[PDB]
Amino acid sequence: PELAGIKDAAPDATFRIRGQKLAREPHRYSGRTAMRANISVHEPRQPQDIDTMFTFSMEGNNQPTAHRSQVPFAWAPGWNSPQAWNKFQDEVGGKLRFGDPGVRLFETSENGLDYFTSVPARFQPQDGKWRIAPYYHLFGSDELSQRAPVFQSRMPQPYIKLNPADAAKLGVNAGTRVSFSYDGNTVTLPVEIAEGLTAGQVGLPMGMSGIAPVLAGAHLEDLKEA
Amino acid sequence: ATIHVDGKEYEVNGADNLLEACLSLGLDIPYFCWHPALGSVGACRQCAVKQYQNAEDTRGRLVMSCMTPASDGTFISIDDEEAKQFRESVVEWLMTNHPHDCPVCEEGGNCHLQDMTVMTGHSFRRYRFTKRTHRNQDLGPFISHEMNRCIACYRCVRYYKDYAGGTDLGVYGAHDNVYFGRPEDGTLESEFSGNLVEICPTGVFTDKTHSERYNRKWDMQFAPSIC
Amino acid sequence: EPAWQTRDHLDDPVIGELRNRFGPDAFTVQATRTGVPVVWIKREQLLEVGDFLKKLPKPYVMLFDLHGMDERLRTHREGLPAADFSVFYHLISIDRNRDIMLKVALAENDLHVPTFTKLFPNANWYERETWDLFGITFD
Amino acid sequence: AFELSAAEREAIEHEMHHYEDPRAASIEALKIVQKQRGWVPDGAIHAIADVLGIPASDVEGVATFYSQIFRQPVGRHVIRYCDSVVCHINGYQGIQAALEKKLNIKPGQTTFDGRFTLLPTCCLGNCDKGPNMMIDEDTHAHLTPEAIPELLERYK
Amino acid sequence: IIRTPETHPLTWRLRDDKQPVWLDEYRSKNGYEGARKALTGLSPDEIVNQVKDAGLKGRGGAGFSTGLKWSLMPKDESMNIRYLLCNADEMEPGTYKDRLLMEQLPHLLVEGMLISAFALKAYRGYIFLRGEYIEAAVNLRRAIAEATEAGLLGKNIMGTGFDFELFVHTGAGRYICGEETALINSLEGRRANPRSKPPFPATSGAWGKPTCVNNVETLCNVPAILANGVEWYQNISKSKDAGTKLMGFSGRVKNPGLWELPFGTTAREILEDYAGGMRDGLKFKAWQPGGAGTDFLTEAHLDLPMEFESIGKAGSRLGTALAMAVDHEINMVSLVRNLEEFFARESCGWCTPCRDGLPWSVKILRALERGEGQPGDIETLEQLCRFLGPGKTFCAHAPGAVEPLQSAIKYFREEFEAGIKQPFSNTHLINGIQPNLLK
Amino acid sequence: VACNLCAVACPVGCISLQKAETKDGRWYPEFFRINFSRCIFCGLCEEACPTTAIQLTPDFEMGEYKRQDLVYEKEDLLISGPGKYPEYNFYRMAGMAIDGKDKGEAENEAKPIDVKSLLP
Ligand SMILES: NC(=O)C1=CN([C@@H]2O[C@H](COP(=O)(O)OP(=O)(O)OC[C@H]3O[C@@H](n4cnc5c(N)ncnc54)[C@H](O)[C@@H]3O)[C@@H](O)[C@H]2O)C=CC1
Ligand SMILES: Cc1cc2nc3c(=O)[nH]c(=O)nc-3n(C[C@H](O)[C@H](O)[C@H](O)COP(=O)(O)O)c2cc1C
Ligand code: SF4
Ligand code: SF4
Ligand code: SF4
Ligand code: SF4
Ligand code: SF4
Ligand code: FES
Ligand code: FES
Secondary structure (H helix, E strand, C coil): CCCHHHHHCCCCCCCCECCECEECCCCCCCCCCCCCCCCCCCCCCCCCCCCCCEECCCCCECCCCCCCCCCCCCCECCECCHHHHHCCECCCCCCECCCCCCCCCCCCCCCCCCCCCCCCCCCCCCCCEEEEEEECCCCCCCHHHHCCHHHHHHCCCCCEEECHHHHHHHCCCCCCCEEEECCCCEEEECEEECCCCCCCEEEEECCCCCCCHHHCCCEEEEEEEC | CEEEECCEEEECCCCCEHHHHHHHCCCCCCCCCCECCCECCCCCCCCEEEEECCCCCCCCEEEECCCCECCCCEEEECCCHHHHHHHHHHHHHHHCCCCCCHHHCCCCCCCHHHHHHHHHCCCCCCCCCCECCCCCCCCCCCEEECHHHCCCCCHHHHHHHHHCCCCCCEEECCCCCCEEECCCCCCCCCCCHHHHHHHCCCCCEEEHHHHHCCCCHHHCCCCCCCC | CCCCCCECCCCCHHHHHHHHHHCHHHEEEECECCCCCEEEECHHHHHHHHHHHHCCCCCCCEEEEEEEEECCCCCCCCCCCCCCEEEEEEEEECCCCEEEEEEEEECCCCCEECCCCCCCCCHHHHHHHHHHHHCCEEC | CCCCCHHHHHHHHHHHCCCCCHHHHHHHHHHHHHHHHCCCCHHHHHHHHHHHCCCHHHHHHHHHHCCCCCCCCCCCEEEEEECCHHHHHCCHHHHHHHHHHHHCCCCCCECCCCCEEEEEECCCCCHHHCCCEECCCCEECCCCCCHHHHHHCCCC | CCCCCCCCCCCCCCCCCCCCCCHHHHHHCCCCHHHHHHHHHCCHHHHHHHHHHCCCECCCCCCCEHHHHHHCCCCCCCCCCCEEEEEECCCCCCCCHHHHHHHCCHHHHHHHHHHHHHHCCCCEEEEEECCCCHHHHHHHHHHHHHHHHCCCCECCHHHCCCCEEEEEEECCCCHHHHCHHHHHHHHCCCCCCCCCCCCCCCCCCHHHCCEEEEEHHHHHHHHHHHHHCHHHHHCCCCCCCCCEEEEEEECCECCCCCEEEECCCEHHHHHHHHCCCECCCCCEEEEECCCCCCCCECCHHHCCECCHHHHHHCCCCCCCCEEEEEECCCCHHHHHHHHHHHHHHCCCCCCHHHHHHHHHHHHHHHHHHCCCECCCHHHHHHHHHHHCCCCCCCCCHHHHHHHHHHHHHHHCHHHHHCCECCCCCCCCCCCCCCCCCCC | CCCCHHHHHCCCCCEEEEEEECCCCCEEEEEEEEECCCCCCCCHHHHHCCCCCCCCCCCCCCCCCCHHHHEECHHHCCCCCCCCCCCCCHHHCCCCCECCECCCCCCCECCCCCCCCCCC
């Protein structure tokens, strides 16, 4: 029952605009008798969509005045660019004409919570243990986006962040390779000197190859120059 | 507020300018430099309408609809002959230096400049002189750069600097040698640099990842989805 | 004025004759580029209007066309009656060298029109095609 | 590799003392670097941006906007001849032809030895004594094509 | 020609050897008496009202009233920070008056800036000066240092408690910087793009603060008003425009120079009685009254008083009132080509009609110069004149660009029609495609 | 140049192609197939072509035994010469830089002026 709002996130598969479905592709969609002609000259059956109100064809509705909230793409006659979204809005720069899609699952509660009494103690750098400070990257921390080949040229090379005091204590410079063991597995990374990172912490790029996001807030042992 | 466009009365928001008020009413005014999220600057001079002082007025005055408030009791004309001639002239001035690039341009069929050139009714070229050209920059793996197609509408710099808070994009140079890009070759550092491919009304900033396996907008199968 | 200009054709004598016979509020004149007067008639007055056009001094003697239109997706219907469907009747007077297009508006649930076959016999096949392709019943 | 000198940095900071916004000293900072080094090299843009606390794109836009800030290497002496309307009536074309004959270059180009850089310029505000030219800091009026070769040798 | 202080308030204390007048000689010749009177015995609103009813108009070239511009400052006491700017740019071709006014009389400008800053309650003042006026910059900085040493500038000026700091900001060579909003943008260290008005700089100018921009000659007219009175300034000339004005003829005349004349002086006396007429063997063809951005006028308009309203009704503008004479030897097409080349290369690039239409006119005039003109070129120039007028571009640079072109087309159309020789051709033949032969 | 104008202008939809790009930057069709069993020989694709690449030629003898063999790939379409338009070249008009033709080298083009140039 807590997920009961997902019924109204979009209308069901029987929803129509004056009897017709919602088109997935523009009216001037081309190559319909040739896009699959090398596999067979016989045109295949148009893919049926029993799940949703959209159709896998142009035989549908994408009018800007159509009473719906799910707009697959914005096109209007004379407006082929993204400026056709002006035609799809009630006022330009406002909302969609018949409401924005999506429904909030919960409202604001009538009463609040109590104050959280458990105030933590201050961070104390213990010898031989390195607190893992999470460093997130827009290109590299999300799991599936790493798999995108265009992100590898944009993803930074993975280093480890060190305080100048901790790096001087360990005798390591910027760029040298240090090896650390987490869960009994030694891995090696180069070093950058992070001035803003507090001493007793080591900075790790979350979500990269070999570094799980679960490592945030964990501790490190035997981190030393390889 | 109450406005009268071409003899038709409309009720609009008085806090809006005339361009967004008329676009919200379904009227078609060509525009380049205005964006709903960026505000009005009055650069491209494309959104000209003829404003009259009162209902019994024949002369009028050409004004920028994006810079003119949609106050109560306004009188304007979009389809006035002089206003149409000026909008066509602005499109013609933008076309003097524009490259012959639409077949090999990723913005083709999705281009705001194409749509406004067609909308003003400008299809005859009388300019016979040379067109200015520009070298391109390497902007990283995501954005492809082609400064020949620029119409100097300043939307990229306004979005990237004022809206997105980026620092490595700017406008350089002078009179008709205005260059929009980075001070040197390199990757655009903003996390929201990809919106330039929709902010730019021409094919200057394009999706390089799409440009690898390119197809036109009419050939796409679209669906509404969540990132 | 060019030949393609949008005209209401209110200067046509047939508009004045229809106004004198049925009243100013009995029909709506639509401005088009068809070159003919387009007159929206109520469904219950269609046979009377057809008979009146048939008995004019220079009468409309030929039913040139009869078909339907699905108006449900039509966005620009300014100056038009409310209609989910419509049926149009193109009638030609050869003695006047003129023609008129009558139009009947139909709701989606009430898709029935009186038949025109008692006035013009070619309305048989025209109404059969309108029923076939649009689902409009002709009583 | 570019490095601002101590005198350059002190002059730039003293210029930022004159305004309520440090961005307002960008033109004077570029002019200070140009005065010290003849022109503004590529690393000077980033150095001035780092000193002023503004993006380097803003400094580059300012430097490429103003014609008297040189973003390309120039000669040891810059001739700037007026090509505006009053000096056109007074005949700057003979002066320009004499300069192109003596220096054997075109406007916008520099000499082979790097001695002179020839440039057209806007009106110098000396139209009643035209034609006028501006070598590095000195303005010369009442120019004649015969006096140009004599005038050029006093700038070694 | 004797120059009494009664009728030549600006140029009477000039020296015959063209040497600058420093603080001792300036104060000897009735220096800072108007500043003393304004800063001791007059309220700032009283000084603003005195300037308003004295009829002092803007000497930049627009003729806007100085007191009216001063009165539009906000009355809020929370807006303490205020800026006064002196437009010493003077980048218009044919204009050389501020160079003379600041190279030899810098203390007059300093006194006028002091009086105007006290009247406007301007806490800071800047002199936006072009970078080519090196000697003027040296003289202005020396005069500022001398006035600060004597206590006329800085903190507690002459016991009043008013604090005023005056700086000199040297430009970097751009013509559009003379426009007041573009001047404000350039002062802030930005690219000199102009701004849309409203809001005007009096409400939110430099760094968002109330700012007043005035020409050198307006601020040099201020101390004479504050020292000799409003009724003296109103009685200098019996015309609508009050006070004197720096006028002068330049370009192939006998005496190309600059003089100070009352408003309402006809243009024939400036050309003949002062500049000595044309040179030997050259006859008069045309003249521009107020610099490069004004309409050309013929010899029939030479019998017209140099007022804003008189030249405005003649189809031109008074401008800076520094007229330029064009003789019969100068080709009008080449002259207009030079003017439009200057105007096109000094565009700031913000708005489409100037940025993309001035180069089109430049290329058309280049073709007309070489005899490569084609039919429709003059029609294109006239269309550019119509569509680059006021209200169509973002600022007033492009209307001033198209004023001389349209005036020369109006008065000398036979010279422009002589350049059209070739038939109009925009396309080449493509083999295999028959062209659409439009008739 | 694989601009896809012929494919969309085809009323039968019997043209399918994909854009590819060489290292110099010129656009070309990676594949180009025409379903001649569907084609009505209306000439709308040749009319729509902005480079005069696709052309309808005086050849009617196109009979076939199997319908699959009426799908003509790019190896069956690309001929050795210019066809009916012997001299037109789109890449001498386009502003895009390709091999042997840099910026400013197309028709009615000026050489690019750097913003760092000393000229006002
Ligand atoms: N070397 C020079 O001095 C040059 C002078 N000019 C002159 O500049 C003129 C154009 O000047 P602009 O400032 O562009 O235009 P403008 O004529 O609108 O403004 C001139 C002055 O009037 C003031 N002003 C006008 N209306 C106002 C209002 N409602 N509220 C507050 N202040 C107001 C402005 O603040 C400004 O100081 C041209 O007509 C030309 O004569 C042009 C080029 C060079
Ligand atoms: C393109 C352009 C250039 C201008 N250049 C100057 C200039 O160089 N010096 C100047 O005093 N005014 C110049 N002005 C006029 C100013 O906008 C403004 O009127 C002046 O600086 C102060 O006005 P004032 O005459 O009332 O003192 C220019 C205006 C325009 C449109
Ligand atoms: S930006 Fe638009 S008009 Fe320019 S070449 Fe590309 S598609 Fe054509
Ligand atoms: S690059 Fe695009 S967004 Fe930027 S000014 Fe040019 S046309 Fe406008
Ligand atoms: S007219 Fe337009 S482009 Fe030209 S200087 Fe003014 S704002 Fe800049
Ligand atoms: S000729 Fe054939 S391939 Fe070309 S548009 Fe017509 S049907 Fe399509
Ligand atoms: S054949 Fe012509 S129209 Fe078709 S994709 Fe190639 S260049 Fe474009
Ligand atoms: S949209 Fe109004 S001037 Fe650009
Ligand atoms: S025109 Fe040359 S100095 Fe003014």
